[PDB]
Design an enzyme around this catalytic site. Structure first.
Site, PDB file in Angstrom:
ATOM      1  N   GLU A 111      33.147  63.470 -47.536  1.00  0.00           N
ATOM      2  CA  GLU A 111      34.249  62.903 -48.378  1.00  0.00           C
ATOM      3  C   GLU A 111      34.501  63.650 -49.705  1.00  0.00           C
ATOM      4  O   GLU A 111      34.653  63.038 -50.771  1.00  0.00           O
ATOM      5  CB  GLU A 111      34.010  61.411 -48.619  1.00  0.00           C
ATOM      6  CG  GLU A 111      33.989  60.653 -47.290  1.00  0.00           C
ATOM      7  CD  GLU A 111      33.673  59.156 -47.433  1.00  0.00           C
ATOM      8  OE1 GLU A 111      33.687  58.607 -48.566  1.00  0.00           O
ATOM      9  OE2 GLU A 111      33.377  58.544 -46.375  1.00  0.00           O
ATOM     10  N   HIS A 142      38.413  56.281 -39.159  1.00  0.00           N
ATOM     11  CA  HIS A 142      38.492  54.855 -39.494  1.00  0.00           C
ATOM     12  C   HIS A 142      39.975  54.501 -39.519  1.00  0.00           C
ATOM     13  O   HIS A 142      40.658  54.667 -40.551  1.00  0.00           O
ATOM     14  CB  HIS A 142      37.818  54.565 -40.842  1.00  0.00           C
ATOM     15  CG  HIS A 142      36.333  54.746 -40.806  1.00  0.00           C
ATOM     16  ND1 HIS A 142      35.514  53.972 -40.008  1.00  0.00           N
ATOM     17  CD2 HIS A 142      35.523  55.640 -41.422  1.00  0.00           C
ATOM     18  CE1 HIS A 142      34.256  54.353 -40.167  1.00  0.00           C
ATOM     19  NE2 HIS A 142      34.233  55.377 -41.008  1.00  0.00           N
ATOM     20  N   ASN A 183      32.427  66.485 -43.418  1.00  0.00           N
ATOM     21  CA  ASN A 183      32.987  65.268 -42.797  1.00  0.00           C
ATOM     22  C   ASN A 183      33.974  64.594 -43.754  1.00  0.00           C
ATOM     23  O   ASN A 183      33.762  64.604 -44.973  1.00  0.00           O
ATOM     24  CB  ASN A 183      31.800  64.335 -42.477  1.00  0.00           C
ATOM     25  CG  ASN A 183      32.187  63.137 -41.630  1.00  0.00           C
ATOM     26  OD1 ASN A 183      32.812  63.291 -40.572  1.00  0.00           O
ATOM     27  ND2 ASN A 183      31.814  61.932 -42.102  1.00  0.00           N
ATOM     28  N   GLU A 188      33.170  58.760 -36.809  1.00  0.00           N
ATOM     29  CA  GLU A 188      32.963  57.366 -37.244  1.00  0.00           C
ATOM     30  C   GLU A 188      34.074  56.447 -36.749  1.00  0.00           C
ATOM     31  O   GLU A 188      34.548  55.581 -37.486  1.00  0.00           O
ATOM     32  CB  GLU A 188      32.903  57.309 -38.782  1.00  0.00           C
ATOM     33  CG  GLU A 188      31.926  58.325 -39.437  1.00  0.00           C
ATOM     34  CD  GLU A 188      31.758  58.162 -40.931  1.00  0.00           C
ATOM     35  OE1 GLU A 188      32.204  57.130 -41.485  1.00  0.00           O
ATOM     36  OE2 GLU A 188      31.159  59.078 -41.564  1.00  0.00           O
ATOM     37  N   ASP A 193      36.373  53.707 -35.553  1.00  0.00           N
ATOM     38  CA  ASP A 193      36.606  52.267 -35.363  1.00  0.00           C
ATOM     39  C   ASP A 193      38.099  52.032 -35.623  1.00  0.00           C
ATOM     40  O   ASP A 193      38.762  52.855 -36.251  1.00  0.00           O
ATOM     41  CB  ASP A 193      35.649  51.348 -36.182  1.00  0.00           C
ATOM     42  CG  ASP A 193      35.567  51.694 -37.687  1.00  0.00           C
ATOM     43  OD1 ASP A 193      36.556  52.182 -38.314  1.00  0.00           O
ATOM     44  OD2 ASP A 193      34.481  51.429 -38.269  1.00  0.00           O
TER      45      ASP A 193
HETATM   46  O1  LIG Z   1      32.510  52.844 -45.325  1.00  0.00           O
HETATM   47  C1  LIG Z   1      32.404  53.194 -43.937  1.00  0.00           C
HETATM   48  C2  LIG Z   1      31.862  54.622 -43.730  1.00  0.00           C
HETATM   49  C3  LIG Z   1      32.799  55.649 -44.402  1.00  0.00           C
HETATM   50  N1  LIG Z   1      32.345  57.045 -44.120  1.00  0.00           N
HETATM   51  C4  LIG Z   1      30.924  57.352 -44.433  1.00  0.00           C
HETATM   52  C5  LIG Z   1      29.986  56.234 -43.888  1.00  0.00           C
HETATM   53  O2  LIG Z   1      28.713  56.424 -44.476  1.00  0.00           O
HETATM   54  C6  LIG Z   1      30.432  54.813 -44.254  1.00  0.00           C
HETATM   55  O3  LIG Z   1      29.431  53.894 -43.730  1.00  0.00           O
HETATM   56  C7  LIG Z   1      29.210  52.733 -44.521  1.00  0.00           C
HETATM   57  O4  LIG Z   1      28.541  53.159 -45.703  1.00  0.00           O
HETATM   58  C8  LIG Z   1      28.337  52.059 -46.618  1.00  0.00           C
HETATM   59  C9  LIG Z   1      27.677  52.590 -47.926  1.00  0.00           C
HETATM   60  O5  LIG Z   1      26.558  53.461 -47.660  1.00  0.00           O
HETATM   61  C10 LIG Z   1      27.477  50.972 -45.946  1.00  0.00           C
HETATM   62  O6  LIG Z   1      27.596  49.780 -46.764  1.00  0.00           O
HETATM   63  C11 LIG Z   1      26.330  49.423 -47.301  1.00  0.00           C
HETATM   64  O7  LIG Z   1      25.664  48.665 -46.287  1.00  0.00           O
HETATM   65  C12 LIG Z   1      24.400  48.142 -46.753  1.00  0.00           C
HETATM   66  C13 LIG Z   1      23.679  47.716 -45.469  1.00  0.00           C
HETATM   67  O8  LIG Z   1      24.554  46.882 -44.689  1.00  0.00           O
HETATM   68  C14 LIG Z   1      24.690  47.039 -47.818  1.00  0.00           C
HETATM   69  O9  LIG Z   1      23.547  46.412 -48.483  1.00  0.00           O
HETATM   70  C15 LIG Z   1      22.583  45.736 -47.628  1.00  0.00           C
HETATM   71  O10 LIG Z   1      22.751  44.298 -47.613  1.00  0.00           O
HETATM   72  C16 LIG Z   1      21.807  43.606 -46.713  1.00  0.00           C
HETATM   73  C17 LIG Z   1      21.856  42.110 -47.039  1.00  0.00           C
HETATM   74  O11 LIG Z   1      21.657  41.354 -45.836  1.00  0.00           O
HETATM   75  C18 LIG Z   1      20.321  44.060 -46.775  1.00  0.00           C
HETATM   76  O12 LIG Z   1      19.640  43.706 -45.561  1.00  0.00           O
HETATM   77  C19 LIG Z   1      20.166  45.573 -47.021  1.00  0.00           C
HETATM   78  O13 LIG Z   1      18.820  45.862 -47.434  1.00  0.00           O
HETATM   79  C20 LIG Z   1      21.152  46.048 -48.092  1.00  0.00           C
HETATM   80  O14 LIG Z   1      20.986  47.454 -48.344  1.00  0.00           O
HETATM   81  C21 LIG Z   1      25.488  47.685 -48.978  1.00  0.00           C
HETATM   82  O15 LIG Z   1      25.993  46.665 -49.854  1.00  0.00           O
HETATM   83  C22 LIG Z   1      26.670  48.558 -48.513  1.00  0.00           C
HETATM   84  O16 LIG Z   1      27.078  49.414 -49.582  1.00  0.00           O
HETATM   85  C23 LIG Z   1      27.938  50.620 -44.512  1.00  0.00           C
HETATM   86  O17 LIG Z   1      26.919  49.873 -43.847  1.00  0.00           O
HETATM   87  C24 LIG Z   1      28.268  51.867 -43.689  1.00  0.00           C
HETATM   88  O18 LIG Z   1      28.927  51.503 -42.473  1.00  0.00           O
END
Ligand SMILES: OC[C@H]1CNC[C@@H](O)[C@@H]1O[C@@H]1O[C@H](CO)[C@@H](O[C@@H]2O[C@H](CO)[C@@H](O[C@@H]3O[C@H](CO)[C@@H](O)[C@H](O)[C@H]3O)[C@H](O)[C@H]2O)[C@H](O)[C@H]1O
Length: 314
Positions: A127, A205, A169, A233, A235
């Site tokens: 990004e 996405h 990416n 990625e 969806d």
């Molecule tokens: O935004 C979608 C894509 C876009 N392109 C790059 C790709 O990396 C991104 O993936 C998303 O990337 C995001 C940021 O890294 C992820 O979002 C994080 O996802 C984490 C795990 O679900 C979230 O925090 C978790 O919350 C849970 C509470 O039940 C806990 O179990 C976890 O320990 C905690 O980290 C964070 O708030 C959130 O910021 C998404 O899962 C993930 O799908």
């Protein structure tokens, strides 16, 4: 073919998913992971926050769990992601100049070395570009290091791992637009100058009913620069709850994306950003949107499933 794995395998392509290693303890999730995909990427476990929570102190347990899953099930392992502006730990945001540069380099080096010979391809930089063209405007890397950080990251990744496929990416780069043009310019530049760079990821996405009609043309012009391409990625989100019309459009959309890949010889395959709507990132970011994946929240196959199978030529 009776599975998406069989369809992709038969096509000579990859069909991958984004894994949360914690969900492997849910047997239904593991059953589908095991049987329906031939590639895996860590949804979160290999990001900077997940791997280097304090300076030069690494936490590889979760990422190792993903790598071990890939090796145990004979799936390709895709690495996500070494350098990304999002979720960057505060300790790194607090550094500047050469101290920040060295933290980036150390991160790339240690993570690539740790997974060397397991991870086949890396999103080295994620990004970097801006909707409307040019560089991203809310990135610690862009703001602290300027334009050269991408090349620095790729050279460091190759120095650590001489053979891994090194990818850049991005999202909103599926059609031909100012953003994908900026990305194209960089890829052409890097290849012209021998900067290590092997592949380009198109996150995809997408929104239901809005698949770029020029997706294949765009993938092809990138492949023609002498790099591989991948849908990384996928969806396709809709306004919830789903209904028959939306599910049918979504199915058609999945077919459009997988066909665009099938139509480009260097398109390595398609990775979907999760298995089940139950765990999709979409609803948390986009209020009232969701139902974006191939399985619903009860792990029933949606119409998208048959569309993917058809598109892989099964
Ligand atoms: O935004 C979608 C894509 C876009 N392109 C790059 C790709 O990396 C991104 O993936 C998303 O990337 C995001 C940021 O890294 C992820 O979002 C994080 O996802 C984490 C795990 O679900 C979230 O925090 C978790 O919350 C849970 C509470 O039940 C806990 O179990 C976890 O320990 C905690 O980290 C964070 O708030 C959130 O910021 C998404 O899962 C993930 O799908």
């Amino acid at each position: 073919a009776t599975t998406l794995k069989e369809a992709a395998d038969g096509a000579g392509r990859d069909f991958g998913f984004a894994l949360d290693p914690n969900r492997l303890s849910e047997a239904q999730y593991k059953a589908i992971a095991d049987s329906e995909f031939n590639l895996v990427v860590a949804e979160n476990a290999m990001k900077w926050d997940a791997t280097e929570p304090s300076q030069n102190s690494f936490s590889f347990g979760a990422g190792d769990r993903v790598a071990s899953y890939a090796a145990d099930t004979g799936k390709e392992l895709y690495g996500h992601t070494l350098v990304w502006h999002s979720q960057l730990p505060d300790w790194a945001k607090n550094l500047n100049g050469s101290a920040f540069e060295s933290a980036m380099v150390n991160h790339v080096t240690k993570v690539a070395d740790h997974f060397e010979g397991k991870v086949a391809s890396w999103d080295v930089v994620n990004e970097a570009f801006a909707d409307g063209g040019g560089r991203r405007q809310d990135s610690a890397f862009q703001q602290k290091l300027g334009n050269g950080y991408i090349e620095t990251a790729f050279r460091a990744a190759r120095a650590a791992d001489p053979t891994a496929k090194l990818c850049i990416n991005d999202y909103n780069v599926e059609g031909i637009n100012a953003k994908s043009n900026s990305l194209y310019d960089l890829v052409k530049d890097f290849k012209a100058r021998g900067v290590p760079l092997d592949c380009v990821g198109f996150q995809s996405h997408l929104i239901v009913g809005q698949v770029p009609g020029d997706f294949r043309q765009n993938l092809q012009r990138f492949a023609d620069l002498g790099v591989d391409v991948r849908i990384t990625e996928l969806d396709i989100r809709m306004r919830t709850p789903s209904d028959a019309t939306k599910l049918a459009t979504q199915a058609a959309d999945y077919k459009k994306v997988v066909q665009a890949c099938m139509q480009v010889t260097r398109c390595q395959g398609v990775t979907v950003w999760g298995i089940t709507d139950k765990y999709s990132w979409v609803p948390d970011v986009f209020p009232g949107e969701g139902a974006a994946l191939v399985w619903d929240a009860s792990y029933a196959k949606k119409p998208a499933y048959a569309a993917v199978m058809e598109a892989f030529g099964a």
